[PDB]
Write a protein that binds this ligand. Sequence first.
Ligand SMILES: NC(=O)c1ccc[n+]([C@@H]2O[C@H](COP(=O)([O-])OP(=O)(O)OC[C@H]3O[C@@H](n4cnc5c(N)ncnc54)[C@H](OP(=O)(O)O)[C@@H]3O)[C@@H](O)[C@H]2O)c1
Ligand SMILES: NC(=O)c1ccc[n+]([C@@H]2O[C@H](COP(=O)([O-])OP(=O)(O)OC[C@H]3O[C@@H](n4cnc5c(N)ncnc54)[C@H](OP(=O)(O)O)[C@@H]3O)[C@@H](O)[C@H]2O)c1
Ligand SMILES: O=C(O)c1ccc([N+](=O)[O-])cc1P(=O)(O)O
Ligand SMILES: O=C(O)c1ccc([N+](=O)[O-])cc1P(=O)(O)O
Ligand code: NA
Ligand code: NA
Ligand code: NA
Lengths: 357, 347
Amino acid sequence: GYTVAVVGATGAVGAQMIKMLEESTLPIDKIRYLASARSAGKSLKFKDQDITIEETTETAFEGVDIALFSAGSSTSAKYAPYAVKAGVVVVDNTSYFRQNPDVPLVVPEVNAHALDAHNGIIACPNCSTIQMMVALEPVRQKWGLDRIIVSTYQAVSGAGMGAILETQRELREVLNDGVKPCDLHAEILPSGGDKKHYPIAFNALPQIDVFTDNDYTYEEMKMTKETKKIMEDDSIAVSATCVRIPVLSAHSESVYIETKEVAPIEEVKAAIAAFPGAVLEDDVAHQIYPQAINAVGSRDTFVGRIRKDLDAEKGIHMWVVSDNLLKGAAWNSVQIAETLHERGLVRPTAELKFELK
Amino acid sequence: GYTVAVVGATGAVGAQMIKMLEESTLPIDKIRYLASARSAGKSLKFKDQDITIEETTETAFEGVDIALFSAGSSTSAKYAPYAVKAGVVVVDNTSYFRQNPDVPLVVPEVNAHALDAHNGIIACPNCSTIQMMVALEPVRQKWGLDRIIVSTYQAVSGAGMGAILETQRELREVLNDGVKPCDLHAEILPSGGDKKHYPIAFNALPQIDVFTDNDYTYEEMKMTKETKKIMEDDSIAVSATCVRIPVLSAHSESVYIETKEVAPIEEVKAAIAAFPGAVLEDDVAHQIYPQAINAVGSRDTFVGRIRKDLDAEKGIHMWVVSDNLLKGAAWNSVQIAETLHERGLVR
Ligand SMILES: NC(=O)c1ccc[n+]([C@@H]2O[C@H](COP(=O)([O-])OP(=O)(O)OC[C@H]3O[C@@H](n4cnc5c(N)ncnc54)[C@H](OP(=O)(O)O)[C@@H]3O)[C@@H](O)[C@H]2O)c1
Ligand SMILES: NC(=O)c1ccc[n+]([C@@H]2O[C@H](COP(=O)([O-])OP(=O)(O)OC[C@H]3O[C@@H](n4cnc5c(N)ncnc54)[C@H](OP(=O)(O)O)[C@@H]3O)[C@@H](O)[C@H]2O)c1
Ligand SMILES: O=C(O)c1ccc([N+](=O)[O-])cc1P(=O)(O)O
Ligand SMILES: O=C(O)c1ccc([N+](=O)[O-])cc1P(=O)(O)O
Ligand code: NA
Ligand code: NA
Ligand code: NA
């Protein structure tokens, strides 16, 4: 079996990583939980076993076969290269390595073949990107994709445990204490790493991550760039608006595409139904469509409201929902680890291709 | 001055109609409040004076100069023709008359001229449509509009007082009692008039109004049809996805357009800033963009996140926010009534 390390085991994603590993098909001989020095020395469960949390350091990866990183880009930048140097295969949830040409950027149902060429780090795309790729790959395969316009409705758990607690606190202040939403004090959202903070309670914040120099946010540009890499087609036009809403878990997306060939609408429904990891939930006669509150806890990605554009012959609109901590993060990463195991790719890399920081 | 009747004075929109009328430049000699038989006899304020709510009937409209209807399509269908007959000018908030070719469908900043052709009824458009029209008209005027694709983030007050209360109760059950959102009982949302009801707490419901035969909802199709009528151009392609989110007041919209001519972004920003009723809030270097919580209580429509599409030469994305009970409903209606007064059309 393997020795598996979870880096960021104490976080929002980390907690789901533990659950996904407990339920995985990976043969696990030893589990290690890694976090900051603040958590090091405390205890967390794996199934019924108590596991002592360790500090993430350049030397924490000895004997580890597979490490799953969900501790923020800076932690991955700092330590993933040392893990690779120790002989580990790293599956990284963060944005840091995603656009590195030596790093496969993988959703297993879509581009598992890219795993074959790994150099010790495999990147998991952004949560919003993953669920969109699951929904759209079955369409791309049959009718092609010319462009994508997406508007997201993103849950707060993607911003971490603190963001969840801040959201809960704000909502209670309004509903229990009678605080006006515009009077709320916020410290984290929309972005922990930005200068100003705004309430999320009863609000819709059109900022996820920080702004880039083209006036799209980093989250929007992640969707654009990761789509082109995952689908291996730079010709796919992608523009996104990423909005945080008061949901704790599960992202929703209003997705518009134009295909290359006209795609019969009922066949689009059938192709999505037929695609592993995608569930067709679409019966408007009975008000059946994907809903965030129903998707929480499931590894599947749910797709409905599928319908042609009123004017563009090749245009299609749909609604895509998935649990952002599962298929959006922890489940995609554990699925990657299972795929690596199943295809004989869990082995130390020959040459180091990543800068030590 | 005028005798003004508010039909549906007791509802979410009606309460704002009262507020907007109290703050209006309309000369009001007499105010009357009308609702259903079960609200009749109760009392409600207009400024400092107590007004008795009356039951809406076929003959209740005697003496009235202006009637503002915000009591749902069925009430307007039933009673508005009788008010017109009695010589009242009706301003109707509902969907019922909006696509009647003899009824002006008006956003005063955009198509006030259409009021000149009225035959006793003027329709106020759908809330989501109104704020979109305020944002996009200044662009249409200079560079044209070829198509619109919009995804909305709609507040629950658009579904009435019941929906607001249902949303608050659901959220408290989750946060205070630890009920899972998927276990909540719901009676109103997504649509009071549809068969199945779903929780809105911690959710996003991709249904507003009921479904039509082409699998878009009536809400989505209103945005399409009302846009074409208001802008008086059937060639503007419009497709919408309308979603309810856990916000009590103020709708937000992610709006994509393609213009007919390339519209430089700084000029687009300046055209929107120049347009009455639109306020530019767009300074991403200081994280300035419209937000629902800041828009509540203002009659303005706020526009930001304005940027070029990454690929389409003529494509532009933006973010549009307005209080749905104000510019989206009660303020648009009162502004129509003021415009009627100012232009001598209260006949
Ligand atoms: N200060 C507050 O008011 C506040 C509010 C909410 C939660 N918290 C607690 O503080 C922790 C951080 O909150 P969060 O919202 O950032 O959690 P999170 O975003 O959901 O997860 C962050 C993960 O990254 C790990 N991490 C952070 N710095 C690291 C480093 N230098 N090396 C390796 N791993 C590192 C964290 O470990 P650590 O757990 O060791 O930091 C945690 O496992 C949480 O575990 C939570 O229990 C504090
Ligand atoms: N006083 C009572 O004991 C009592 C009992 C039941 C309901 N209600 C009222 O019913 C409303 C139910 O909430 P909601 O979410 O449906 O409100 P809403 O959508 O926010 O507003 C609906 C408005 O339309 C009016 N209306 C409905 N049917 C009508 C008819 N046949 N003729 C004329 N006006 C009509 C309502 O008056 P009404 O207020 O008369 O419905 C109300 O003013 C509440 O606003 C409440 O005021 C009052
Ligand atoms: O931005 C992201 O996509 C992202 C997603 C997940 C995680 N994580 O630690 O699980 C971290 C990041 P980010 O690159 O740190 O912001
Ligand atoms: O659906 C609508 O557009 C709408 C909007 C406002 C009001 N109202 O009574 O203020 C009613 C309707 P609807 O046509 O009753 O559903
Ligand atoms: Na499937
Ligand atoms: Na094998
Ligand atoms: Na057109």
